[PDB]
Symmetry: C2
Subunit: 314 residues, 2 copies
């Protein structure tokens, strides 16, 4: 297939190259930014995103997939400015990130109406531009598969069947929300190989992770650097074990890094070892060197960062 890119002509999926599948140029709550602009500094957000993207490119990253959608402050014009300043291939998406209920707008509205919003972004363009969405992003977390969460999942299935774009999820690794997302999507006719079940790297429960991979979907070991969810060393051991056991062709690795994010800062926790620097390049500083010196060869690295994204977007 051809993948739409922000600020560029679309590319063939075979040309995606080395990809970070889950990173955020910027995240914010739409209602807070609209109501209290004094809390934000767009110039700093722009500088932060440009600098992070440039650093990723210096390590060989060719494409970044950014699943900032409704609920996380997607801004296609900000994204296109970052592209112009860096030259990155940037894949933007459509979708909705909620944990409980949809915004009031959606009262009395059908799953088809929700799907039409996603299809609009895929076929016509995002936010009044010709930049088109290349995937759909959906979520579930601690509250489980609520009524409105299910509506969004089913709308993503409709958009995938109509346009063939893949689906990226946010899940909570400690309930079975990821497993439920996969099942609900596949029951609607979505190819399991067109789904990335997100945030599975937040657990060391390898049997749960493997169960989802064995059902055909990519597994998101996608929060490297967020020690609050799982420390880097345990993520590395889980990643290494999955590679040793033959799961390279389902593994996707990223950081979920937010070059800026507006949420309040949680209480710091200090451990014996110096805290890792969460960024878009931590895997080049820590994870990839760790895998290599544990015997993981170059072909595994190419599978995870090139072949798997290529398949996902094919």
């Amino acid at each position: 297939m051809r993948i739409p890119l922000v600020g560029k002509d679309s590319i063939e999926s075979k040309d995606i190259g080395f990809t970070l599948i889950h990173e955020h140029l910027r995240v914010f709550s739409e209602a807070v930014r609209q109501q209290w602009p004094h809390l934000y500094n767009e110039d700093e957000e722009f500088r932060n995103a440009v600098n992070e993207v440039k650093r990723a490119m210096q390590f060989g990253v060719k494409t970044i997939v950014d699943p900032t959608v409704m609920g996380l402050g997607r801004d296609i014009r900000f994204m296109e400015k970052v592209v112009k300043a860096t030259g990155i291939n940037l894949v933007a998406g459509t979708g909705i990130l909620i944990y409980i209920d949809l915004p009031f707008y959606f009262l009395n509205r059908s799953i088809d109406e929700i799907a039409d919003l996603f299809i609009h972004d895929i076929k016509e363009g995002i936010q009044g531009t010709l930049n088109k969405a290349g995937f759909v992003k959906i979520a579930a977390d601690e509250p489980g598969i609520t009524k409105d969460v299910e509506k969004v999942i089913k709308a993503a299935a409709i958009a995938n069947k109509e346009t063939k774009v893949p689906i990226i999820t946010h899940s909570n690794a400690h309930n079975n929300t990821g497993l439920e997302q996969q099942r609900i999507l596949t029951e609607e006719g979505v190819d399991p190989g067109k789904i990335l079940i997100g945030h599975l790297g937040d657990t060391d429960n390898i049997d749960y992770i493997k169960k989802i991979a064995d059902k055909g979907s990519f597994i998101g070991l996608d929060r490297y650097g967020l020690d609050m969810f799982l420390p880097v060393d345990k993520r590395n051991e889980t990643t290494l074990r999955l590679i040793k056991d033959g799961y390279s062709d389902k593994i996707m690795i990223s950081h979920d890094y937010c070059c800026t994010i507006d949420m309040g800062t949680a209480k710091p926790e200090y451990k014996p070892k110096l805290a890792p620097r969460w960024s878009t390049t931590l895997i080049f500083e820590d994870t990839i060197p760790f895998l290599k010196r544990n015997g993981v060869n170059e072909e595994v690295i190419a599978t995870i960062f090139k072949e798997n994204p290529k398949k996902f977007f094919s």
Copy 2:
């Protein structure tokens, strides 16, 4: 006190004149408008608001209080354009309308931080303008007094104690959310006479309505025309009974009219009598004529629409 007005110098509260205490120039879900602008037409929204405001002014309305805040799409620049086009006195507010949880921005943030946002809008101005907020708006509905709902209530109390602006609420008339809002605010030191408990006209449970008025707060008979909550005739009978029983000095009347609103349309219900035309002038067409021909004198009308707002803002 002096009441700040959008696009005008502040006025003494004695000069507020005939007031509609709860009307919306425009409502939308911030995240949906940001992500799917194709669903909206600002020129139509502007025309609708200007035309409604002009009609209200033709019946003698001097001031409109608009409690559109975070969660309902407050836009101070849109409001100031409507003022420029009409000459209305418009009171804008600050606050947050949620039913369950706050946006992700508020994770790990204190009640004091929330109050600081409201105080910023009151003292410094709304959305980067010098238009200042003249009241705080808070909500609770079917989910009851959740953790985050309580946080917003307590933040409104802090803002009221610091700045002396009054508090308008949204409640669900069929639970005791309005009674709970009143109690929580008064326990924090808010004068009950600085509170309007909203949406009480949605019930004909006169004992519940009177209980709140007797605890010192204004009662919002504030959704005239929304037959889905309560039909006009039963609202009129409840209003008349409250007047007959001596409650004029606590009654506030409005329509909650939204000149535009983005929410999906509920299923229509057709009754034997022609449905009333919900607008900002329905009370001049129906309610006020009904009260007068049932013996309600001009002094009652002046109490409800002039003296009560004056007290509320004093």
